[PDB]
Amino acid sequence: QVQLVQSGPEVKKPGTSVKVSCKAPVFTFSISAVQWVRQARGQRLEWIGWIVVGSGNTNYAQNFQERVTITTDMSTGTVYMELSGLRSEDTAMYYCAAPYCNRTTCYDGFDLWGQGTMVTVSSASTKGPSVFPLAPSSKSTSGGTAALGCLVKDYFPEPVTVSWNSGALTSGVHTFPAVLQSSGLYSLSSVVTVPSSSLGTQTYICNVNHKPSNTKVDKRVEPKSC
Amino acid sequence: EIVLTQSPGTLSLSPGERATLSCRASQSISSNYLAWYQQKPGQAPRLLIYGASSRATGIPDRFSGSGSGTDFTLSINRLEPEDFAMYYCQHYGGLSRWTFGQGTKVEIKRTVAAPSVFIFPPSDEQLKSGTASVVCLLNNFYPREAKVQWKVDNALQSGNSQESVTEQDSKDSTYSLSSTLTLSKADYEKHKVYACEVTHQGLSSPVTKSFNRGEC
Amino acid sequence: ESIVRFPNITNLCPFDEVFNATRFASVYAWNRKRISNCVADYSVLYNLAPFFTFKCYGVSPTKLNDLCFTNVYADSFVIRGDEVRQIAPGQTGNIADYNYKLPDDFTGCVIAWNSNKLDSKVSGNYNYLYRLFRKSNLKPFERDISTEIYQAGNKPCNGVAGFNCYFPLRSYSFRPTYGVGHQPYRVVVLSFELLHAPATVCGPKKSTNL
Ligand SMILES: *[C@@H]1O[C@H](CO)[C@@H](O[C@@H]2O[C@H](CO)[C@@H](O)[C@H](O)[C@H]2NC(C)=O)[C@H](O)[C@H]1NC(C)=O
Ligand SMILES: *[C@@H]1O[C@H](CO)[C@@H](O[C@@H]2O[C@H](CO)[C@@H](O)[C@H](O)[C@H]2NC(C)=O)[C@H](O)[C@H]1NC(C)=O
């Protein structure tokens, strides 16, 4: 199908009001309908509302009804959604979901959906991540493998790209999901499983590139001999 | 009010095997104003059901769930990699508020794996920063339901346990977990014995991975 | 010096009876005021209001007086401000596609003037409405009264106002604080159709002295 363009993510202070732009590329909402739905990581699509765009008649889910407003922009065919009284836990994915509307019939059920917008209420100005190693226990390498840890802590915004040996090393590599720990700060963990014989022989570097903070940091995991 | 509860979402199911997703509601609703949506993580769901069965465009007869009044269900006849996703039932009747469903974790039936528990001493660079965190690495465990518990100097804490769960890795189709014991360097010096005891269904006896700051 | 003496003015064709309206009609309907045998007093048109927007589609605006035609079909409607130029034959739009459309061969003229004070009030008069959709595009010169909830899906909602089952009227959002593009004007039109009739509607003629 066609993809509806959606506004870029931002981060704001608590108590603000956010306007998120969702506009169909070549689909004017003449008699069409839409509205937004929200998810946090792994949670329900929390419904927000629905508007008959052609009309303007609204419904506000009686949950955020006092803080959610919608208006359309027929001229450019954009729908809007303002969420006032932004508090902490409103940090979540935003989706604008509409059904296809042929001018004579619409396919019952919203199918043409937006890209997805990230909204963060928590502070603060992008935390360019700080990384530290986690060397495997010397006496724990008896099993033929060692766990060389890679901790990334406290970063903002949304998750940083972490690579092993400039992306060449991918064997026994798993990246760990969002690790919000205290005051909303996001962390993560990375470990590569490697043979014990290759500890000292081959250099093992964490290549962490955080584009939003422009903080490209490299740290080498050297297993302590004990 | 409308409370529509879904099936026991956590579906561990072998490929090709049948599935059934009940969307029992708290009120009687017409059997047309409900649809089912399928979501791969990191992208929005997709339309599956239009009205009654009404298999969606592109989607074959594979998804032909039904139901009426207060009972509504979704049935899966086979399994394909795209089927392993979040399933959502949603009510869209009248000018009334549109009710949504919690979700359903359609996944693959596996063996009962065990978490390979490895603990890690805090790194010297991190100590020089005035902090200390101990990492309890759980890997290749199944099912997802795991309890991670921290005994420090044989004293029990759960509050300062920031855990998360990786999705089933493609190479092995099972979860990996990491718990971090965030604490100030003062707490690092105050405590000598640090450990992580892990209980799992795959673990008849809970495993306790212990390390000492003297050796680690 | 030619004598052009003619009998008296006879009976005024009642137009200002329509234009001097207490309350005009919504585009949802039409006044459709038929004016019968009388003298077509079209001549008196300039004294409506400042900035009377006028433009015709087949008859000379000023020499209209002498051209006697058969009958007149007169109807009126206030419209959303900027939509004035929607009222034109063969020009698609919102109202022109689902409210009222002029056939291409409409020989008549279009009259429009601003309303503002008379229509718009600070409290807001949501009495006037307009169409939102239809099963199909209306044939020209046709009136729709049905208030049937639309069927945008494969299922007839019967009588429930639901998703993809919409109501066909929204009000004229008229607040005086709105812009010139949103200010309600008053657009009327006068049909000058030809038929098989003795052309019982003609403009009057002046006279000389004795
Ligand atoms: C918009 O209206 C309908 C929706 O698809 C289209 O008309 C359908 O055409 C098929 C042709 O086989 C018929 O079977 C359906 O019965 C028609 N729909 C209905 C509701 O009767 C029409 O072609 C679409 N037009 C555009 C411009 O997309
Ligand atoms: C609508 O009403 C106005 C107000 O009475 C009419 O304007 C008057 O017309 C008479 C004769 O045509 C003049 O003597 C007055 O000076 C006019 N008054 C004002 C304030 O303009 C007007 O003719 C009517 N409009 C139409 C076209 O019927």
Numbering used by the authors:
A (entry chain H): 1 to 226
B (entry chain L): 1 to 216
C (entry chain C): 324 to 533
Copy text verbatim from the article accompanying this structure deposition:
Here we report the characterization of 17T2, a SARS-CoV-2 pan-neutralizing human monoclonal antibody isolated from a COVID-19 convalescent individual infected during the first pandemic wave. 17T2 is a class 1 VH1-58/κ3-20 antibody, derived from a receptor binding domain (RBD)-specific IgA+ memory B cell, with a broad neutralizing activity against former and new SARS-CoV-2 variants, including XBB.1.16 and BA.2.86 Omicron subvariants. Cryo-electron microscopy reconstruction shows that 17T2 binds the BA.1 spike with the RBD in “up” position and blocks the receptor binding motif, as other structurally similar antibodies do, including S2E12. Yet, unlike S2E12, 17T2 retains its neutralizing activity against all variants tested, probably due to a larger RBD contact area.
For this reason, we solved the structure of the complex between the highly mutated Omicron BA.1 trimeric spike and the 17T2 Fab fragment, reaching a resolution of 3.46 Å. Our analysis showed that 17T2 Fab binds to RBD in the “up” conformation with all particles containing 3 17T2 Fabs, each one bound to adjacent RBDs within a single spike trimer. Due to the higher conformational dynamics in the 17T2 variable domains and the RBD regions, resolution in the contact area was lower than in the rest of the trimer. Local refinement was performed in this region, significantly improving local resolution to 4.41 Å. After refinement, we determined that 17T2 Fab binds to the left shoulder-neck region of the RBD that is only accessible in “up” conformation. Fab 17T2/RBD interactions involve both the heavy chain (HC) and light chain (LC) of the antibody, covering 563Å2 for the HC and 295 Å2 for the LC of the total interaction surface. The contact area mostly involved Van der Waals interactions with a minor contribution from hydrogen bridges. In addition, we identified a salt bridge formed between the D420 residue of the RBD and the R103 residue of H3 that stabilizes the binding of 17T2 to the RBD. As previously described for structurally similar neutralizing antibodies, 17T2 is glycosylated at the N102 residue of H3 located near the left shoulder of the RBD. The 17T2 Fab binds to a large and mostly conserved area of RBD, with mutated residues harbored by SARS-CoV-2 variants located at the edge of the contact surface.
